[PDB]
Amino acid sequence: MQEQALTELDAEKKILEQSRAGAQSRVDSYRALYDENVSAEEKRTMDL
């Protein structure tokens, strides 16, 4: 039963790794948004 109690931790690690991957995808998305501050076309609107 100790081996089962110890593969349960290898399962908890998978849960936390999916959390990590979700949060990393969010950081990747918002960094792109915040870095491309205004689109090439939002500047075109202001010039217009």
Partner: protein
Amino acid sequence: VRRTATEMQREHMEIQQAQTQAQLEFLQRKFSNKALYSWLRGRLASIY
């Protein structure tokens, strides 16, 4: 995984129950059981 570990805890508890049954069986089959000493106590009490 936690469920297959709880099923193993259940089989562990079942093996414990079988072992308590084996200990009771041993205490009841063994020669120097309560019945022997009761007979000897009554018999010796009459003699005494």
